[PDB]
Amino acid sequence: SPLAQQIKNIHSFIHQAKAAGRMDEVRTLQENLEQLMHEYFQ
Residues in contact with Zn ion by the rule CB under 5 A: 38
Shortest Å distance, C-beta 15 to Zn ion: 6
1 binds, among its own copies, Zn ion, none (CB under 5 to 8 A by kind): none
Q: Which is nearer to its own copies, 21 or 38 (CB)?
A: 38
Burial of 6: CB neighbours in 10 Å, binned 0-12, 13-18, 19+: middle
Q: How far is CA 13 from CA 23, 39, 42, in A?
A: 11, 20, 24
Q: Point out which residues bind its own copies (CB under 8 A).
A: 7-8, 11-12, 14, 30, 34, 37-38, 41
